[PDB]
Design an enzyme around this catalytic site. Structure first.
Site, short mmCIF file in Angstrom:
data_model
loop_
_atom_site.label_atom_id
_atom_site.label_comp_id
_atom_site.label_asym_id
_atom_site.label_seq_id
_atom_site.Cartn_x
_atom_site.Cartn_y
_atom_site.Cartn_z
N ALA A 197 -5.83 5.47 6.06
CA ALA A 197 -6.65 6.54 6.48
C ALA A 197 -8.03 6.66 5.89
O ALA A 197 -8.47 7.48 6.05
CB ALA A 197 -5.74 7.75 6.47
N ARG A 248 -7.20 -1.82 9.33
CA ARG A 248 -8.44 -1.24 9.20
C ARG A 248 -9.11 -0.80 10.51
O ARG A 248 -9.68 -1.57 11.24
CB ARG A 248 -9.21 -2.28 8.66
CG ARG A 248 -10.66 -1.78 8.20
CD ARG A 248 -11.29 -2.52 7.22
NE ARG A 248 -12.15 -2.14 5.95
CZ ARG A 248 -12.58 -2.74 5.10
NH1 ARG A 248 -12.35 -4.03 4.91
NH2 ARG A 248 -13.64 -2.32 4.30
N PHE A 263 -7.08 1.30 12.21
CA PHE A 263 -5.94 1.88 12.71
C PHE A 263 -5.95 2.65 14.31
O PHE A 263 -6.05 3.59 14.43
CB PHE A 263 -5.77 3.06 12.03
CG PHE A 263 -4.18 3.80 11.80
CD1 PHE A 263 -3.41 2.87 11.17
CD2 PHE A 263 -3.97 4.78 12.33
CE1 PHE A 263 -2.23 3.44 10.94
CE2 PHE A 263 -2.54 5.30 12.35
CZ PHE A 263 -1.67 4.62 11.58
N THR A 304 -3.42 11.35 11.04
CA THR A 304 -3.00 12.43 12.04
C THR A 304 -1.91 13.00 12.07
O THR A 304 -1.58 13.68 12.89
CB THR A 304 -3.24 11.41 13.29
OG1 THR A 304 -2.52 10.31 13.15
CG2 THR A 304 -4.68 10.96 13.67
N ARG A 349 -4.59 7.52 17.38
CA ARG A 349 -6.06 7.33 16.82
C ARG A 349 -6.96 6.58 18.02
O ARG A 349 -8.18 7.16 17.98
CB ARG A 349 -6.08 6.77 15.60
CG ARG A 349 -7.44 6.63 14.92
CD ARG A 349 -7.47 6.16 13.74
NE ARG A 349 -6.84 6.94 12.54
CZ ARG A 349 -7.59 7.92 12.06
NH1 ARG A 349 -8.67 8.26 12.44
NH2 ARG A 349 -6.69 8.75 11.25
N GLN A 375 0.68 -1.06 0.18
CA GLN A 375 0.00 0.16 -0.06
C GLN A 375 0.82 1.21 -0.07
O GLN A 375 0.36 2.35 -0.03
CB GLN A 375 -0.78 -0.15 1.44
CG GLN A 375 -1.50 -1.24 1.67
CD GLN A 375 -2.47 -1.04 2.77
OE1 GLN A 375 -2.45 -1.83 3.69
NE2 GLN A 375 -2.97 0.07 3.06
N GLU A 384 0.71 -1.40 4.84
CA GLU A 384 1.17 -0.27 4.95
C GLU A 384 2.55 -0.02 5.19
O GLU A 384 3.28 0.95 4.61
CB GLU A 384 0.53 1.08 5.97
CG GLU A 384 1.02 2.03 6.23
CD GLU A 384 0.06 3.18 6.83
OE1 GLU A 384 0.48 4.09 7.01
OE2 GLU A 384 -1.02 2.63 7.23
N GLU A 416 -12.47 2.57 6.36
CA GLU A 416 -12.54 2.05 7.74
C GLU A 416 -13.86 2.09 8.66
O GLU A 416 -14.18 0.96 9.27
CB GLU A 416 -11.56 2.96 8.54
CG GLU A 416 -10.17 2.60 7.74
CD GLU A 416 -9.01 3.37 7.87
OE1 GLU A 416 -9.00 4.50 8.30
OE2 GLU A 416 -7.88 2.75 8.22
#
Ligand SMILES: Nc1nc2c(c(=O)[nH]1)N[C@H]1C(S)=C(S)[C@@H](COP(=O)(O)O)O[C@H]1N2
Ligand SMILES: Nc1nc2c(c(=O)[nH]1)N[C@H]1C(S)=C(S)[C@@H](COP(=O)(O)O)O[C@H]1N2
Ligand SMILES: O=c1nc2[nH][nH]cc-2c(=O)[nH]1
Ligand SMILES: O=c1nc2[nH][nH]cc-2c(=O)[nH]1
Ligand code: MOS
Ligand code: MOS
Ligand SMILES: [Ca+2]
Ligand SMILES: [Ca+2]
Lengths: 760, 760
Positions: free
Chosen positions: B512, B341, B343, B443, B309, B196, B231, B713
């Protein structure tokens, strides 16, 4: 960075054999290989086509015929078609008739020879006269352009010269041969080839497969030489490769063995040129009338533009109050001729050049003053025009030739030679000076565009990409240099990437010596946008104005502080400022009408001059170039080394064209000279023993990338000087017109000697 | 085109096995294949390393060790390093120690097992308490954010609940496993991989080879699912591939066998969540205090943002006058956990959701009104803020949940169930409503950027390209859709190309849930450019204004004439107008500060709600989901089909998480569940039998591409209703707090049963 003599971008790689060309790329084990099976007649209907022996040959996998072609079957670079595989009839010996995909190059080659083909032959047209006779031609009739009224001019002329002479073609002989590879890629294809024109390869493959353009991607990183040979005949290979691929399910590569390559592809248009020229008593030209018979081959290819350029160069370097050209583009059953360094230009120029020399001999004048007297006027009410009506506002020929003659010790040498001749009875030296004026830009106007796409990564390095193709001429380095110059960083940070229609679209072929002029601008355009973003960002950050942010030598400076380019980029990255951009460019001021022969088809002209000295052997005609001196104008060169090199190489090629290079066909149309053992380019020792090349260093009047000037084709015309000199030597052997034809092989020279000697 | 329910871009190719994923790409016969040999110790110093047996094994070609890495040895997505090969010591079972390159994947695996390694074991830290105990952690100490005064609040509260509970991690189980391939390409490398985050793969490969970024291109056409697991853990495969390939001179591929993949990559962060929450007599929340212990594994990976998060979502869907969170990110000698998914968001939200249920049960109140009562206020002086002080200006939960309850016949269904339970002594059904609010945007603010490069060819087709990566979520269709809409032509004319860092640079990972929000904008941005140039051109040509040129349906209209888009394009090409453009976008309004816990870290919030119904068997704990009903807010969906799909699949996975997925390590730290035979994702039959999903159709308040909303997500959080409902069934069996832990496997449920039942 622009301006420094840096090496070619793949120098080291060339020199250790890591640079890869097409046939070097790694490819899957199942890749097939292809070879065409060719017609053995110059002109006929095909009557039977038994391929069973073919399918049955070892390792073969698929065999193809026009009927198997799923969609278009046409590789021509022009609106009239040229089948890739023969449709019922053939038109020259070489025309591909069917296609073989087997598990190996040899294999395919071997099979290609087993077909059983029956033909119903037809009368063939192989010579200009034949063509002429039969009205076998392109463009429904000749093209005529005329400025003023020549016959009037010439009827009342103190001096006159009529003459007719032959100019033979020339085979490119690019060291890497035509070649391509196609890889089915879910839905579409990806072609790798060795071509000067990937955007067209795209178009032709797409049509060949019935796919919208977006499903076809051509990548091309480097060609081993092209000289125009690859402006279009890259099409047949790509088409066959894509078509075999779509059918067999697997990657298919094709590369021509040398012999096939010479038999199938085209060469430079051979020309017959017929001229009458005339002048004043003081020597000013009064008018020149020219007829061009040009051998185009069995299909249109690029004959149209080519012949347009030669007409366009029929004024050579001189201003002529009246001038006419009648240009026939004769169709004949032989290889479809095409582009070659110069693209018509040399033919037209040599036309005027031969004449003006004939003129000079006629009036016992010295050719050099005669020329020098008729060059266009220098720059700086009413400026002169060419016969197509474009003001020539930048001709520095007078200055330059002068400078060259001095630096070459022209006068003195000329005498030393006369003397030397008078003491010899078997050898004669000869020497000549010839000038060059070449116009820059495609005559087909809308081709003059280019695009680039540039990326700057967070570590500060850069990836440059543009529409051009590197065929050995240093394009990429120049584009690297321009980019590093505009962004303010060291070239080392700039990497070139391969040419890829999926990155810059809708490109023109890399040609017309327009590679650098235009791409250069485009890259500069991208880099300017990028730099723009950086300065904007620096400025807001450091409160103050963008135009005072300075990028130089890898450093950025603003408000007394200074940072490394990288540090700026990272920060722009953090700031979210796009670091990617495209850039594009279109040559301004151009407009002209082909049918009328009027307009400004060019931005500016390129010039230069060359003085070559040679000797010939009165008994056999053997002969060779002892010394050459050139002074050529490359604008404010973007890379002097790179330019000197194109100049030296072009000269050789140019001379090569008028000396040992000779194409020959047999009475049935077969190409007899189809291999290096019988087609002879300049070998190392033909290099001039003393070769001085230097540049005129003067900015271009017109606004081009750093006021540089195209330098890829022009210099090719300096070859004329060699032929001219060869002819000076004959002239020294008797009092008659040597009427030396081109190419000047030794047989040819020996013939000139005799004429001039009056021994027949 | 935006707005229509169109199929995924590669649906035909999925369905006939033509879509190629990384291991399907054809590659040269000489390609090598790799595998890591792994540590078998949770934590030790490597004392001896005999690889001789390895080199000796069949088909082996090279073997590598940290000492062999030529430059960096670091694959971490974060400032602290995480070696690709172990450096002297190991920190979890699975940590790669050396790397084998053989002539076949099996060969590689087999050799990887033959090493003789000696270790000098050390005490290992495997559990949260252990780490807590040993002060084993990241960020030098916990992170605390506080809004208001909780102690005060609680102390004085009519109602209160303290509770503590475990949440387990989750293994991605992406159907295609990690994988990469690297091809030396004269001086640099080209990487294909399944990730990704190609721009990062670039970064790390470059650093590992010692190359500027511009000598490294990563192309990534599609992943077989990623969910977060790609990721960053794509890094090790790519680095090893590149490294092997610099050394052996040949292409090297690497793909992980399932068992290896599950042992080596990370998983969702399992959490322990301690809470005290309190309210008013009327039910309004007064404060809530939370402690999050989070197991991150031996190395930083993305713990940092993840844990941010979760804090970020500890308010679940409710406004809370005071609320504090102390978040420990504990290091342990286990797989380095990473993105998944949600996060962190789910863990944070689950935290609040458990607690508010506990509170509800405590006060004999129905959870659903309790929640309904504390949702943020709808939109339209002083708007409420979250505990990080970001106004919540768009929360439609109230309206939505209501609509959902009714369409799902909630109340009646609640009753039917009570009765049913009262007649049953072995089964018990449970039902629960659970809401979601999810912030959209990385974020780590500067990540929120995207770019695109579009091309239009002269036949009118179009090649789209952006920075996002397709991993099953429909991104390329949505991007094609935006493009077709903005350009005014049918989507068929637009083809997507592989993500390629040499085409759009410096990208963020696709994550995200921001793939489309952003790339959508950038693509709009380039299309708008190009449509701009076209209008300009038509305008000039037909004299009139650009704003009156109209592209719709594949046709272009102006001053009462109309033509086909392709006719416009060709005409522009001839007019020499660039048909290429890049595009860029950066989300606005963001600013916030991690350390203080204050700011606007999000553009907007995604919402939705889900009511799940289940049955459990009071004897063994067996259980299943009978029916689920969802209503989720995708803004003005860019593609309702594709959006319903993400809601469905995410719901399933979310439940998956809280029911059968369970990770298990043995006393030595070895992963006991490391293969589908022992780690169990939802299988076909665990789909809810009645599964109604419906979209809330309202344009986003914020200016997002077509006013749509991210939907990747958020919808995963709807799984929580399944767990909450499993807990309702437990509750139905006795008057005691079941204290159901997660995952609710049947063992887990049965245990809850008994608590509720007072049977221990
Ligand atoms: N070394 C080398 N130089 C070359 C060629 C080539 O094939 N090899 N092709 C020529 C032709 S036909 C042209 S039209 C110009 C192109 O130079 P440019 O890209 O800068 O226009 O290259 C000339 N110089
Ligand atoms: N089918 C499918 N859907 C998916 C994933 C996946 O691998 N496959 N990854 C999830 C995660 S972690 C994110 S962050 C989003 C990405 O949505 P977006 O790219 O449009 O931002 O994919 C979500 N949905
Ligand atoms: O005007 C042209 N000049 C050329 N030189 N080399 C290729 C050329 C072409 O297509 N057209
Ligand atoms: O805030 C983030 N949320 C994410 N979801 N999936 C990947 C993410 C990331 O890097 N950051
Ligand atoms: Mo030039 O002759 S491509
Ligand atoms: Mo999302 O979690 S990549
Ligand atoms: Ca050729
Ligand atoms: Ca994983």
């Amino acid at each position: 960075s622009v301006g420094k003599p840096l090496p070619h971008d793949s120098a080291r790689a060339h020199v250790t054999g890591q640079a890869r060309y097409l046939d070097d790329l790694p490819c899957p084990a199942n890749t097939l290989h292809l070879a065409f099976g060719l017609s053995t007649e110059a002109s006929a209907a095909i009557t039977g086509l038994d391929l069973e022996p073919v399918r049955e040959s070892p390792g073969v996998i698929a065999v193809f015929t026009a009927a198997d072609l799923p969609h278009d079957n046409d590789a021509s670079p022009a609106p009239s078609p040229e089948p890739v595989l023969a449709t019922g009839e053939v038109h020259f010996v070489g025309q591909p008739i069917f296609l073989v995909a087997a598990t190996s190059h040899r294999a395919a080659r071997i099979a290609a020879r087993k077909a059983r083909i029956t033909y119903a032959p037809r009368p063939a047209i192989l010579t200009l006269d034949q063509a002429l006779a039969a009205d076998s031609r392109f463009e429904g009739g000749p093209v005529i352009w005329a400025r003023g009224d020549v016959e009037t001019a010439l009827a009342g002329a103190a001096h006159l010269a009529e003459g007719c002479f032959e100019i033979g073609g020339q085979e490119h002989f690019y060291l890497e041969g035509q070649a391509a590879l196609a890889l089915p890629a879910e839905g579409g294809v990806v072609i790798h080839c060795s071509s000067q024109h990937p955007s067209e390869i795209q178009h032709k493959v797409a049509h060949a497969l019935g796919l919208a353009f977006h499903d076809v991607r051509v990548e091309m990183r480097r060609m081993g030489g092209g000289f125009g040979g690859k402006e279009s005949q890259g099409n047949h290979l790509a088409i066959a490769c894509a078509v075999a691929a779509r059918a067999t399910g697997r990657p298919c590569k094709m590369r021509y063995d040398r012999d096939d390559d010479m038999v199938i592809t085209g060469k430079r248009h051979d020309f017959r040129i017929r001229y009458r020229i005339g002048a004043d008593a003081s020597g000013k030209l009064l008018g020149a009338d020219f007829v061009h018979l040009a051998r185009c081959g069995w299909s249109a290819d690029l004959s149209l533009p080519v012949c347009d350029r030669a007409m366009l160069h029929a004024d050579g370097s001189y201003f002529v109050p009246a001038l006419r050209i009648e240009s026939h583009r004769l169709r004949t059953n032989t290889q479809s001729n095409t582009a070659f360094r110069g693209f018509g230009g040399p033919q037209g120029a040599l036309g005027m050049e031969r004449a003006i020399e004939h003129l000079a001999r006629g009036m016992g004048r010295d050719p050099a003053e005669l020329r020098a007297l008729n060059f266009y006027d220098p720059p700086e009410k009413k400026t002169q025009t060419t016969h197509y009506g474009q003001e020539v506002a930048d001709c520095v020929l007078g200055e330059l030739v002068t400078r060259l003659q001095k630096s070459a010790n022209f006068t003195t040498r000329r005498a030393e030679i006369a003397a030397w001749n008078s003491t010899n009875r078997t050898l004669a030296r000869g020497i000549a000076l010839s000038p060059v004026k070449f116009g820059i830009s495609f005559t087909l106007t809308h081709l003059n565009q280019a695009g680039a796409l540039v990326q700057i990564y967070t570590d500060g390095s850069v990836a440059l990409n543009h529409g051009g193709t590197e065929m050995g001429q240093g394009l990429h380095a120049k584009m690297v240099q321009v980019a590093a110059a505009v962004l303010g960083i060291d070239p080392v940070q700039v990497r070139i990437t391969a040419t890829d229609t999926s990155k810059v679209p809708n490109t023109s072929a890399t040609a017309a010596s327009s590679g650098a002029d235009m791409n250069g601008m485009a890259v500069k355009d991208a880099c300017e946008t990028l730099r723009g973003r950086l300065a904007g960002f620096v400025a807001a950050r450091e409160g103050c104005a963008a135009r005072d942010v300075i990028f130089d030598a890898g450093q950025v400076q603003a408000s007394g502080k200074s940072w490394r380019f990288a540090e700026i980029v990272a920060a722009a990255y953090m700031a979210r400022i796009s670091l990617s951009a495209t850039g594009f460019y279109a040559t301004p001021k151009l407009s002209w009408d082909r049918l009328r022969g009027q307009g400004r088809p060019f931005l500016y002209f390129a010039y230069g001059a060359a003085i070559t000295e040679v000797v010939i052997d009165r008994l056999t005609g053997e002969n060779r170039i002892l010394r050459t001196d050139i002074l050529h104008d490359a604008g404010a060169s973007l890379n002097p080394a790179l330019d000197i090199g194109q100049i030296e190489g072009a000269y050789v090629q140019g001379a090569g064209w008028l000396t040992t290079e000779e194409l020959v066909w047999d009475h049935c149309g077969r190409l007899m000279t189809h291999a290096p053992s019988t087609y002879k380019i300049p070998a190392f020792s033909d290099r001039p023993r003393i070769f001085n090349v230097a540049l005129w260093d003067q900015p271009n009047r017109e606004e081009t990338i750093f006021r540089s000037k195209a330098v890829g084709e022009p210099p090719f015309l300096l070859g004329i000087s060699a032929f001219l000199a060869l002819h000076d030597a004959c002239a020294a052997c008797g009092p008659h017109w040597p009427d030396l034809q081109a190419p000047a092989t030794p047989e040819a020279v020996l013939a000139a000697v005799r004429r001039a000697e009056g021994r027949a």
